[PDB]
Structures are given as structure tokens and as C-alpha cells.
Amino acid sequence: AEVKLYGFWPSPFSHRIIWALKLKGVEYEYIEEDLSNKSESLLKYNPVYKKTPVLVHGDKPIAESLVILEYIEETWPENPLLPKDPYERAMARFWIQYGVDTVAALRAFYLGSGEELEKAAKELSECLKILEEQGLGDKKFFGGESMNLVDISYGALGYWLAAVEEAKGVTVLKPSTLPRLHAWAKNLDELPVVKENIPASDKMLAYVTAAM
């Protein structure tokens, strides 16, 4: 294995990299890290952040899921996950950067209780409406007719958010309020490259339930 991926099973940050590698057809060794007892390999390869995911290519480490994704795209350029046009590439990177705001809104929802949960749900819905209207639009994928790095970055809005929503008893990504984004997430969830490379729904639900 010339490519190694140090990951954490329930983490969308790790799943992102799995999906990219499989869309590129890159053969890799997956190594599961116990975040409570981090291996010497993980600490050696990611001294700055000491966390997963880390991609190691020819014993050279790349940390941070967004940086890893760009590395995969540049290193294996066939089956492109970014477009050719600089402006279109900038729009992909813009919506990936908006993912930082989205992660923050997801976090708040994930940690909310009571009236706080309600508020967090509302703010997450507002965040996703902007993503839907101004990012996805009427396209089947953020990548147009096929997946790009933006689709990969937001894939957790399907399986992962759905598990959090079930645990919380509050659904934010719903068909009546976000019909295009919901259809996008459902289609993505049904793609074999996604469905084969996420945890089973009951394990996913049990994990987010406990970590609450």
C-alpha cells in the first residue's frame, strides 16, 4: 500500500477521503485510530493537530481533510473532482469554505438542548437554505452532472445529519423546506460509492447518541 489513511470510523472527515480515493480508484490501506489512545504513527504524521484524517503517500503525510482532498485531485487528475475553469474552481472552493459555517451550525445543533436546540435548528435551516439556493441551485450535483469535491464535502448532510436528527427528534433537512437540497442528499446517499462507504445507520445512530 503506497497510500495509507489514518481515520476514525464514524467521522465524516474520514469518510470524505474514503469517497475521494474510491472515486479516483486509488488503492489504499485504512488504519483505524483510537482517538483516546493515539498511535505513535498518527502523532508522528500529524504533530500539529494530532487527529484524523491523515493521508500518507510514500511515507509523506497530508493532514486536514480539505487539504487532503485537493492533494488527491492534483495527484490523481483523471476523473476530475474540480472543474477546469478558474472561476468555476473558485466557486467550488467558495462553497467548500462555506462548509466551515455549515460545520459550525451543525455543531450547535448537535450540542443543543431545549430552547437552545430549537434555535440551533432554525439557524442550521437558514444556513442550508443559502447553500441550496446560491450553491446547489437546480443542478443534480454541486459538480453539475457528477460529484465534485463540494459534493464530497457536504455528503454528511445525508447519512450523518439524518442520524443526528433522529437522535435529537428534530429534522432540519426536510423535503418541504429544502426540496432541492433534500433531493440532492437522498440521491447522493443512494450512490454506491457513498452507500458502500458509510457506517450502517444503526451504528451511526448509536455513536452520535452516546457522544451526546
Q: Please, could you describe this protein's structure?
A:
Belongs to the GST superfamily. It is found in: Cytoplasm, Cytosol. This is Glutathione S-transferase. This protein has 212 residues and is an alpha+beta fold. It has two domains: 84 residues, no CATH class; 128 residues, no CATH class. The protein has ten helices and four strands. α4 runs antiparallel to α5 and α7 packs across α10. The chain is globular and about 45 Å long.
**Which percent range describes the beta-strand content?**
5-15%
Assembly state? monomer
Count of domain modules: 2
Ends: how far apart?
36 Å
Supply the helix-strand structural class. alpha+beta
Name the helix and strand elements from N-terminus to C-terminus, one letter apiece.
Answer: EHEHEEHHHHHHHH
Approximately how much helix is present in the residues? 55-70%
In DSSP terms (H or I, runs of 4 or more residues), the helix count works out at: 10
Radius of gyration: 17 Å
- What general form does the structure show? globular
Order of strands in the sheet with the most strands? 2-1-3-4
Major beta-sheet overview: 4 strands, mixed
Strand runs, count: 4
Protein name: Glutathione S-transferase
EC number: 2.5.1.18
Enzyme class: transferase
Function: Is involved in the conjugation of reduced glutathione to a wide number of exogenous and endogenous hydrophobic electrophiles.
